[PDB]
Structure formats: C-alpha cells, structure tokens
Antibody, heavy 185, light 217 residues
Framework: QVQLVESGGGVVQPGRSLRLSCAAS????????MHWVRQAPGKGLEWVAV????????DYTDSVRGRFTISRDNSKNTLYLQMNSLRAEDTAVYYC???????????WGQGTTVTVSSASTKGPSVFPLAPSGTAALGCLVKDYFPEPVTVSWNSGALTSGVHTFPAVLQSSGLYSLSSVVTVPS | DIVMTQSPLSLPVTPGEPASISCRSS???????????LDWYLQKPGQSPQLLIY???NRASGVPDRFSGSGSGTDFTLKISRVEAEDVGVYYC????????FGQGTRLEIKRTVAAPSVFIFPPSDEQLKSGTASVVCLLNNFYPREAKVQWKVDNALQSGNSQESVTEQDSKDSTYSLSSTLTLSKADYEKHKVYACEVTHQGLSSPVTKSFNRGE
C-alpha cells in the first residue's frame, strides 16, 4: 500500500513534549522531501515543517521555531516531529505529507491528534434526555477529558435519525456533547 | 510571507450546477521557469486533504474531468462542472513559491430549499440535579440553511453567556443541519425559576418558535 501513517499523538500539559512519527510504505521514501501540516479544531491547514530527502534544508513555521525539530530515518522509512515546550495553541491534528516534483503535497496521512491542555483525565457523567407525531430523545455526555467519546444507540441497531453533536469545550476545560435520535411518537 | 485570500468562505451549490471559487495571492506565483506554484486541495468531511490541481492548471491523478484550475500571477480560479454530493468539503489553495502558506478554505455545501427546524426542549435529569448542576438542552432538528438563532429565557428573562451550542455537518441524505444548545445553571439558580424556554429564529419560520417547560410539572 502506498501510504503515510502518523502515530504518537496524544494529550499533554503545556510545557511538556510529544514525539510524532510517520511511517511511509509503498514507495522509495529516501527520494522524497517530507512535510508536517496541522489543523487546529475547526480551523484551516497550516504548514509546520519541511525536510529534504537527505535530511538537509530543514525549515519551520515561525511559531514553532526553537520548539519543534523535524528529522527522518531513511533506513526505517520514518519521518519524525519532536515537539518540545508545547503550547495550548499547538492543539491540532498533525498530518505528514509527501512533496512531489511539482512541490505539491500529493499524499497525506490520516493524521494524529494532539491536545495540549492543563486539564486532567476525567470520565463523563451520562444523563438522559427524556421525551416530552415525532419524538426526540437522547443522552447528555457531560464533563469529560480528553476527546474523544463514542456514542451508539441500541448497541448499533439504531442508526436512522441519530445525530451525535460535536463536543463543546466548557470554561472548566472539560468537554460535553449530546447525542439525539428522533423516533415515531 | 505570501498571503492567500480565498473567496467566498462558503458556497452552497445546487446539485448539477457549476461552481467557481477564487484564490488571490499577495504576490505573483509565476516562477521564472514558467510554472505558477499554486495547488488546490479538497478536504472531504472527516477525511485528510487530497490534491486536486497542481501548478495552477494540472489535474492530479484520479481527479475527475469536471475539476479545472485556471489563472496566472496572482488571480486563480477553481471551477467545478456539475457539482454533486461527493464534491462537498473544504477547498484549500496553497502556494509553494516561497515559505508555504494556505488560503483559509472555501466550504462547499449542497444547496436545497428552506426547511424549518423541528424544536425540542429537554429539562435537566433528576440524576444530574442530585449532583448540583442543571443542564437544559434545546434541539433544532433537520433544518436548512445553517443559519439559526437560539435564545434562552428563564421566567421570560433573556439569558446571556451561560449557553453553548454545536452544529452537525450537513447530512449527506437530506442536506440539512441540526443544532444542540445547552443552558447551564446552578441547581440553586435552577430551582429559583419556573418557566424554561428556548426561542428559535430561522428563515423557515415566519416568527420565532418557543418550546418551554414548567420546572416540576
């Protein structure tokens, strides 16, 4: 499979670190320049760093200079991003991308999620949203950290009419989301 | 520091009709070698970006005939013939003449006729009330277009700053949105008032719709 596969994302406190890896398969990794690109929640794409096929000509977006280091191991077909002194604004999905001869990003990984937050791990409380010719009911999944939670209905046999909403980040630093389904009264 | 300006930010397209979107750069992307170092990407919902157009006008591998890129210098255009459901997502331009920068994205969505929201209100559960907090939830289901307004009222007093909301992505089958709004109160404050209401404003409604309950009924 011609593929890039990121790993090493996670959840750390501000000032801590994370090491991202990108495993390349299906092509001659040693011939390609490679990049990191990131996308903060609900935001657009931002270029992060570049490294040439031979490890030279490294460069970084200004906000990560002196904190992130890009490197590669051609014998392991792997690209790395060492992310030190993390800041809240580094929270994002991180993608590795292959640079082609046209200097376009012709292949992207699935991305790995990074959350930088002072919060500590907390399971949610789950509360019912009880019904009052169509009825609506659901569940309120409140006060958890970090993302994600998954929500299913009737162990998966109920899918039609389900809406599982994007989580909101509360001022407490904890997340909350709701899942609802409409059914016949 | 080349700044890429995309427009519009959002583009509802009736299925079958053409789409056109703009990317303008703050300096020429035309290299001395004759190429414009400008690429277009599509990020479909929940997916990774994928290359559509490279060097201004060249279709990447596997890209349908109906996508075309044009322009030179600072003014570029991506055109889609016969927009279909599979084309929805955020379209991003990118320049690689200098330090790589992206446009802020154009979100393409399916245009349909107006559908009013179906509104539901949910009181806090007894289990949550035990804990000291009351969350009141308002659901606005399967509406179009996306723009909607929720106003919380507590004994007819307009609430401000104590609610959050989120919206689903456009549903691929019926092209509608849904919205959830949560009002959060102390149990102490919750038990000082009687009528909880969410008033919904939307284009499909000739005047705002209110759903409400009486605490304790």
């Amino acid at each position: 499979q011609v593929q890039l596969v990121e790993s090493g994302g996670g959840v750390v406190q501000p000032g801590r670190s994370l090491r991202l890896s990108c495993a390349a398969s299906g092509f001659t990794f040693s011939r390609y320049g490679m990049h990191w690109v990131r996308q903060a929640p609900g935001k657009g794409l931002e270029w992060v760093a570049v490294i040439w096929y031979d490890g030279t000509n490294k460069d970084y977006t200004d906000s990560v200079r002196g904190r992130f280091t890009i490197s590669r191991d051609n014998s392991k077909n792997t690209l790395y991003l060492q992310m030190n002194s993390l800041r809240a604004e580094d929270t994002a999905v991180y993608y590795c991308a292959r640079e082609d001869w046209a200097e376009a990003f012709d292949m992207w990984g699935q991305g790995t999620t990074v959350t930088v937050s002072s919060a500590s791990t907390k399971g949610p409380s789950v509360f019912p949203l009880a019904p009052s010719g169509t009825a609506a009911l659901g569940c309120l999944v409140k006060d958890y950290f970090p993302e994600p939670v998954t929500v299913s209905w009737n162990s998966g046999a109920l899918t039609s009419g389900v809406h599982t909403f994007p989580a909101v980040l509360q001022s407490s630093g904890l997340y909350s989301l709701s899942s609802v389904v409409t059914v016949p009264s | 520091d080349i700044v890429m300006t995309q427009s519009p930010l959002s583009l509802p397209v009736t299925p079958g009709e053409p789409a056109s979107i703009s990317c303008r750069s703050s300096q020429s992307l035309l290299h001395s070698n004759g190429y414009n170092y400008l690429d277009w990407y599509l990020q479909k919902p929940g997916q990774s970006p994928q290359l559509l157009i490279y060097l201004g006008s060249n279709r990447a591998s596997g890209v349908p005939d109906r996508f075309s890129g044009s322009g030179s210098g600072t003014d570029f255009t991506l055109k889609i013939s016969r927009v279909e459901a599979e084309d929805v997502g955020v379209y991003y331009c990118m320049q690689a003449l200098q330090t790589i920068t992206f446009g802020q994205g154009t979100r393409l969505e399916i245009k349909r006729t107006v559908a009013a929201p179906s509104v539901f209100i949910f009181p806090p559960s007894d289990e949550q009330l035990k804990s000291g907090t009351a969350s009141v939830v308002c659901l606005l289901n399967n509406f179009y277009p996306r723009e909607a307004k929720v106003q919380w009222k507590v004994d007819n007093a307009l609430q401000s700053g104590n609610s959050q909301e989120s919206v689903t992505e456009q549903d691929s089958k019926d092209s509608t949105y849904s919205l959830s709004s949560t009002l959060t109160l102390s149990k102490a404050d919750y038990e000082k008032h009687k009528v909880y209401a969410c008033e919904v404003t939307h284009q499909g409604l000739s005047s705002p719709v209110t759903k409400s309950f009486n605490r304790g009924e």
